[PDB]
């Protein structure tokens, strides 16, 4: 026999590691049961449980059930700029009332990024110019360089941008005449010969999408590139 109140009733490493999504509702359960040997509730508790290093009171303990809750009434657990909370580390202090001993059990909460932000274009519209003698294959727009196009505050794939020309019902030949062969630059290339005398102006719908790993979680935004033909 050893009297081991305040020890974990589990193997694995000493730290308890869990994951939640950013923007989880108030009262989200982080840990169902800490599995600390002893009884914190009731007539004669054997242990006293408390939280140390609980910066900004993001975590709350029900000591009877050894349940940890997310405390976010009137705030958002946001992983994206400007809040940038990627994890939460707190210490569950256990005091053994009978022997006067104290121990910390660490709890690492990893905050997973959600695709909660869309690509947003820096300008309402873009403009390019092409001489009608420009050869097919020539790059006629690079206006997205230096983050002058779409940006996405999410992290990793959720924040990475792909640029794709859409069919424009107001200008049907525009998506036949220009292409984005490299969807990560959004540089626009001429696909067909121009003729000032037939058409002086094109309206090119460009859609930016983020690269979320689940296709039906992807967010998208639209801009118009106006292309003017020069003679």
Report the C-alpha gap between 221 and 115 in whole angstroms.
14
Q: What does the per-residue mask of binding to Ca ion show for 156-195, with x meaning CB under 5 A? A: --x-------------------------------------
Indicate whether 5 belongs to the interface with Ca ion (CB under 5 A). no
Cβ 194 to Ca ion shortest distance, Å: 35
List 163, 210, 223, 227, residue binding Ca ion (CB under 5 A): 210
| Residues forming a β-bridge with 121 | 150
| Residues forming a β-bridge with 201 | 228
56 DSSP 8-state letter: G
Nearer to Ca ion, 16 or 158 (CB): 158
Cβ 197 to Ca ion shortest distance, Å: 44
CA dihedral of residues 83, 85, 86, 90 (deg, nearest 10): 170
Report the C-alpha gap between 190 and 138 in whole angstroms.
6
Nearer to Ca ion, 45 or 157 (CB): 157
Cβ 227 to Ca ion shortest distance, Å: 28
List 5, 113, 162, 171, residue binding Ca ion (CB under 5 A): 113
- The last residues before gaps in the chain (C-N over 2.5 Å) are none
| Nearest to 191, CA basis, from 148, 141, 121 | 141
Decide if 189 contacts 179 (C-beta within 8 A).
yes
List 50, 51, 78, 164, residue binding Ca ion (CB under 5 A): 78
Cβ 13 to Ca ion shortest distance, Å: 29
Q: Cβ neighbours of residue 22 under 8 Å, at least 6 residues apart?
A: 76, 77, 78, 79, 80, 85, 111, 112, 113, 114, 116
Cβ 90 to Ca ion shortest distance, Å: 22
Nearer to Ca ion, 48 or 78 (CB): 78
Stretch that binds Ca ion, among 32-40, 170-178, 190-198, 210-218 (CB under 5 A): 210-218
Distance of CA 190 to the CA centre of its chain: 35
Cβ 113 to Ca ion shortest distance, Å: 5
Decide if 20 contacts 28 (C-beta within 8 A).
yes
Kindly state the number of chain residues that form the binding site for Ca ion, as judged by CB under 5 A: 11
Report the C-alpha gap between 66 and 214 in whole angstroms.
35
- 116-155 binders of Ca ion (CB under 5 A): 116-117, 152, 154
Cβ 56 to Ca ion shortest distance, Å: 17
Nearer to Ca ion, 22 or 171 (CB): 22
Interface residues with Ca ion (CB under 5 A) are 78, 80, 113-117, 152, 154, 158, 210
């Amino acid at each position: 026999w050893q009297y081991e109140d305040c020890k974990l009733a589990r193997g694995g490493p000493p730290a308890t590691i869990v994951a939640i999504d950013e923007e989880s509702r108030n009262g989200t359960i982080l840990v169902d049961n800490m599995l600390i040997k002893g009884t914190a509730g009731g007539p004669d508790p054997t242990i006293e449980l408390s939280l140390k290093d609980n910066v900004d009171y993001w975590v709350l303990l029900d000591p009877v059930k050894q349940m940890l809750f997310l405390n976010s009434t009137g705030r958002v657990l946001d992983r994206d700029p400007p809040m940038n909370i990627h994890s939460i580390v707190v210490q569950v202090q256990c005091v053994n009332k009978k022997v006067g001993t104290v121990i910390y059990h660490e709890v690492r909460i990893v905050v997973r990024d959600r695709n909660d932000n869309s690509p947003t274009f820096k300008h309402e519209s873009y403009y390019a110019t092409v001489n009608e003698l420009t050869p097919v294959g020539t790059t006629i727009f690079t206006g997205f360089s230096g983050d002058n196009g779409a940006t996405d505050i999410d992290d990793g794939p959720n924040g990475q941008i792909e640029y794709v020309i859409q069919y424009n019902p107001e200008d049907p030949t525009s998506n036949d005449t220009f292409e984005i062969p490299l969807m990560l630059t959004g540089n626009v290339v001429l696909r067909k010969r121009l003729n000032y005398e037939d058409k002086t102006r094109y309206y090119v719908i460009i859609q930016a999408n983020d690269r979320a790993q689940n296709l039906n979680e992807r967010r998208t935004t639209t801009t118009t590139l106006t292309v003017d033909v020069l003679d």
